[PDB]
Design a protein around this ligand. Structure first.
Ligand SMILES: C=CC[C@@H]1/C=C(\C)C[C@H](C)C[C@H](OC)[C@H]2O[C@@](O)(C(=O)C(=O)N3CCCC[C@H]3C(=O)O[C@H](/C(C)=C/[C@@H]3CC[C@@H](O)[C@H](OC)C3)[C@H](C)[C@@H](O)CC1=O)[C@H](C)C[C@@H]2OC
Ligand SMILES: [NH3+]C[C@H](O)c1ccc(O)c(O)c1
Lengths: 352, 107, 428
């Protein structure tokens, strides 16, 4: 008939042409409640949102200086329906502030919606929600993975190009409370003092080598305390490992306490590395705030929270979501070859 | 062709007959590990019958060698994969595929 | 009585106008019945609509009031429109006949050479030739005789009893309804000859033998249980659907007349559009012309079995339909389908070893019926005219008008013949 099974809700089929999402403060609650409902937006309003977000982000420093009571968060990877759960767990942006360390886009079917929501929320709140840059925000990884096809199907490719031109301006260091450092990857041999990341320009796509590429791609050893820094890695094959002496020397030369990062998925959601004997806080902390990564690992996410010189960790849980076909195929392209094969088989069998 | 190199082999006293249906949780990729489909992104096993030719022949001659519970890892050549024509939408032509099938039950 | 005749003429004019306008709208609007043959049909419908609307009411008023108070000029105009409409209809009929002959004798040449522009050009050419042949002699007064009362009716405004010049009658019957008549008769006779010979070209006979070998019930038609007799045809999921594509008559049975038409839809050299249309027709579970959500879900539920949850399938179907609607109806048409699919190149995957194209056999009996009806309705009047040429006038003046009215009334016969056709029936 009209609908064989009706218990499942229907996606609204009317776009929003910049008249309700805006006011120029953008409206957030209705944008959430319409993106929560598998809605959509007009193309021009999406361009306006992304361009405004780029304009606010470009004026920001290259090494963000953040105040104390923050709520650090890990890499999302397009899990929109868990991004809201993150927001209801760690307090809504009205009263508490956020520091998003890692990437957002590839390896998920709701990445454009996630980045649209995050950048509208950044437009409305410009000094109470800080964003950082991850490795999945380039022209190689996104085209390789399922983001370019996502923008091509849902929206026009011009949205994709604007989105890249606006990802290319995020900050990358984000010092925190004059005690911590909050990078997406880790240190680099070419970077020794904090001022060394106050110089290089971030307005270009990360190279395959150098100081920037080694801050978004690096990865620490799994055996801290290994017998004797700059050993290459094989998991990425694009940057350097770094052992306990490297981090310890970095924190001794520059008076800090710890570094945070958001690559290595943790089944508990977080990991505090080997204890630093100098002070007593762990030198390296790994966050991860994407539950059910790739829908198979069946982990659980986590959200660090820093307050009153105490880091307390809020655990997390998954959440259901709608279903998309792999690589966004409509049912006609999905099942037409099978239809042709079955018709041809039956006819070549009936004739003889 | 097709080669099975088990990871966590299980009981080998049961083998798939020609007239039975095998249930598997396949998690396929391309040769470089770029995952394109999985049966754990859905909460549902994949059920297929031998003899009848609907699965690619690589499954037909690569799942037969397995047993109950024996997780494996299939390297399907372009001869036994979709071949020259490929599949519109997902798989480019002349593709070598890698699967992670796991036979669980037989009905 | 006078009132009864007036009511009859009013009903006849209303029926003619309504039917012709219905046919014109059905051809023009649906954008699928826009074959060149359908354009010729539109020209014919325009011709007989013009004749109906303009001529029939006024001739009715002439026969009713017994006095024609409209004018000498208006009389000339009316008789010339009459002659124009009859000649135009008879010429477009033979144009259709020759078109069908060329389409059957060599399908590829007609498919490639003839385009829409050529159809418009030839239609306008034949219309203007007939229009010249009808206007030019009438307005220049070539037909007025010497008989004194004929001159009186020429002078008197009331009288319009057509009067020949003893030479105008002969020249017009034999430049308008005797050359095109014989042409459209023997050309279409050759069309039947070629169709009958082509239907038995040593290939269809093998299919007939296999058909009779597969027909277990020996009733002359194949039922569904007979198709699941084949041990490797039963396990097919989408067998039922294909039966419902072959079963175009709706009776529940497939017979040799439509089995070959269904199989001939697939060929090594068949048209791409035919195969794409067949692919589309799998999803139309009611042949309504549009793919609903219930149809697009019940078709997919018999292929995926229970490998996807019900909710996941419904969600992806919803998203597909929402992204495919280019007009807001909520159901996909064939144009939207050919916008979505097309580029996959799936028409190359539906191939069967048969080599014969029985495409131009679906529109042969209806056109023959139209030609036979037109000849049967209009020939008696011209034969009486050729008897009456000579002043022998064996009996006339009150037989001669009833035959002109039998000729007039046939313009309503075409829409009925069209609605007898299945696609035109569902169109209306
Ligand atoms: C609704 C109708 C479609 C119907 C869909 C389902 C029942 C759902 C089922 C989970 C399929 C998945 O749909 C989400 C999806 O599985 C893949 O992702 C995949 O990992 C794959 O390669 N598999 C699946 C596991 C068995 C091996 C192989 C396959 O042989 O699959 C078979 C296959 C595609 C046969 C091809 C057909 C084309 C020929 O040219 C070719 O001949 C060489 C043989 C499947 C079982 C078909 O029998 C049935 C269907 O197709 C494909 C990449 C694309 C495929 O969607 C199409
Ligand atoms: N009223 C005249 C009748 O319709 C008719 C039709 C065609 C002719 O060539 C003709 O002379 C007369």
């Amino acid at each position: 008939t009209d609908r064989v099974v009706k218990a499942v809700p229907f996606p609204p089929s009317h776009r929003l042409t910049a008249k309700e999402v805006f006011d120029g403060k953008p409206r957030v609650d209705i944008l959430k409640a319409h993106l929560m409902k598998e809605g959509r937006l007009e193309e021009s309003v999406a361009l306006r949102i992304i361009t405004e977000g780029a304009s606010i982000l470009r004026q920001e420093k290259n090494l963000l200086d953040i105040d104390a009571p923050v709520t650090v968060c890990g890499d999302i990877h397009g899990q929109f329906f868990d991004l809201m759960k993150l927001f209801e767990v760690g307090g809504s942006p009205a009263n508490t502030r956020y520091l998003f360390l890692g990437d957002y886009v590839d390896r998920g079917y709701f990445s454009i919606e996630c980045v649209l929501y995050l950048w509208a929320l950044k437009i409305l709140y410009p000094k109470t929600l800080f964003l950082l840059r991850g490795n999945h925000e380039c022209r190689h990884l996104t085209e390789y993975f399922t983001f370019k096809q996502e923008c091509k199907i849902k929206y026009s490719e011009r949205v994709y190009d604007a989105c890249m031109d606006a990802f290319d301006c995020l900050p990358l260091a984000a010092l925190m409370n004059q005690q911590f450092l909050c990078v997406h990857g880790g240190l680099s041999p070419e970077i020794n003092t904090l001022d060394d990341i106050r110089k290089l320009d971030r307005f270009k796509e990360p190279p395959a080598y150098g100081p920037m590429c080694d801050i978004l791609w690096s990865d620490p050893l799994e055996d801290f305390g290994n017998e004797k820094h700059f050993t290459h890695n094989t998991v990425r094959g694009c940057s350097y490992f770094y052992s306990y002496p490297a981090v310890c020397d970095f924190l001794q030369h520059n008076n800090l306490l710890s570094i945070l990062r958001a690559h290595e998925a943790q089944d508990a959601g977080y990991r505090m590395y080997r204890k630093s004997q100098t002070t007593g806080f762990p030198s390296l902390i790994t966050i991860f705030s994407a539950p059910n990564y790739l829908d198979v690992y069946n982990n659980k996410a986590a959200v660090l929270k820093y307050e009153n010189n105490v880091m307390n960790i809020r655990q997390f849980n998954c959440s259901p979501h709608p279903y998309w076909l792999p690589n966004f195929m409509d049912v006609f392209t999905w099942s037409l070859p099978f239809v042709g094969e079955k018709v041809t088989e039956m006819l070549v069998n009936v004739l003889n | 062709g097709v080669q099975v190199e088990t990871i966590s082999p299980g009981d080998g006293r049961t083998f798939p007959k020609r007239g039975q249906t095998c249930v598997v949780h396949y998690t396929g990729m391309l040769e470089d590990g770029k995952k394109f489909d999985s049966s754990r992104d859905r909460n549902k096993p994949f059920k297929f019958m031998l003899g009848k030719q609907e699965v690619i022949r690589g499954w037909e001659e690569g799942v037969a060698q397995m047993s109950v519970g024996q997780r494996a890892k299939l390297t399907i050549s372009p001869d036994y994969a979709y071949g020259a024509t490929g599949h519109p939408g997902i798989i480019p032509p002349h593709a070598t595929l890698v699967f992670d099938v796991e036979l669980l039950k037989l009905e | 009585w006078v009132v009864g005749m007036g009511i009859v003429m009013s009903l006849i004019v209303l029926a003619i106008v309504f039917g012709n306008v219905l046919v014109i709208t059905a051809i023009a609007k649906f954008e699928r019945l826009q074959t060149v043959t359908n354009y010729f049909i539109t020209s014919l419908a325009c011709a007989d609509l013009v004749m109906g609307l303009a001529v029939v009411p006024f001739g009715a008023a002439h026969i009713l009031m017994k006095m024609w108070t409209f004018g000498n000029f208006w009389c000339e105009f009316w008789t010339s429109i009459d002659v124009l409409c009859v000649t135009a209809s008879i010429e477009t009929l033979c144009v259709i006949a020759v078109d069908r002959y060329f389409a059957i004798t060599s399908p590829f040449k007609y498919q490639s050479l003839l385009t829409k522009n050529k159809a418009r050009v030839i239609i306008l050419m034949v219309w203007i030739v007939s229009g010249l042949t009808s206007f030019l002699p009438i307005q220049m007064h070539w037909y007025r005789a010497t008989h004194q009362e004929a001159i009186n009716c020429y002078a008197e405004e009331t009288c319009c009893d057509f009067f020949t010049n003893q030479a105008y009658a002969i020249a017009s019957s034999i430049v308008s309804f005797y050359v095109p008549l014989v042409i459209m008769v023997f050309v279409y006779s050759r069309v039947f000859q070629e169709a009958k010979r082509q239907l038995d070209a040593d290939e269809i006979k093998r299919l007939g033998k296999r058909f009779k070998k597969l027909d277990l019930d020996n009733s002359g038609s194949l039922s569904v249980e007979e198709f699941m007799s084949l041990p490797e045809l039963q396990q097919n999921p989408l067998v039922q659907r294909v039966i419902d594509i072959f079963d175009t008559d709706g009776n529940g049975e497939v017979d040799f007349k439509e089995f070959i038409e269904g199989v001939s839809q697939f060929s090594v050299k068949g048209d791409k559009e035919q195969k794409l249309r067949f692919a589309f027709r799998i999803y139309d579970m009611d042949k309504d012309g549009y793919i609903s959500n219930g149809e697009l879900f019940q078709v997919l539920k018999m292929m995926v079995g229970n490998n996807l949850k019900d909710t996941q399938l419904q969600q992806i179907v919803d998203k597909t339909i929402i992204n495919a609607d280019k007009d807001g109806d909520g159901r996909i048409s064939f144009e939207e389908f050919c916008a979505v699919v097309g580029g996959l190149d799936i028409h190359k995957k539906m191939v069967v070893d048969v080599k014969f194209c029985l495409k131009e056999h679906k529109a042969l009996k209806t056109l023959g019926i139209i030609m036979g009806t037109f000849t049967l309705c209009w020939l008696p009047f011209f034969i009486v005219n050729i008897v009456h040429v000579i002043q022998d006038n064996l009996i006339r003046k009150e037989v001669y008008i009833l035959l002109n009215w039998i000729g007039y009334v046939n313009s309503g016969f075409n829409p009925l013949i069209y609605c007898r056709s299945p696609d035109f029936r569902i169109a209306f």
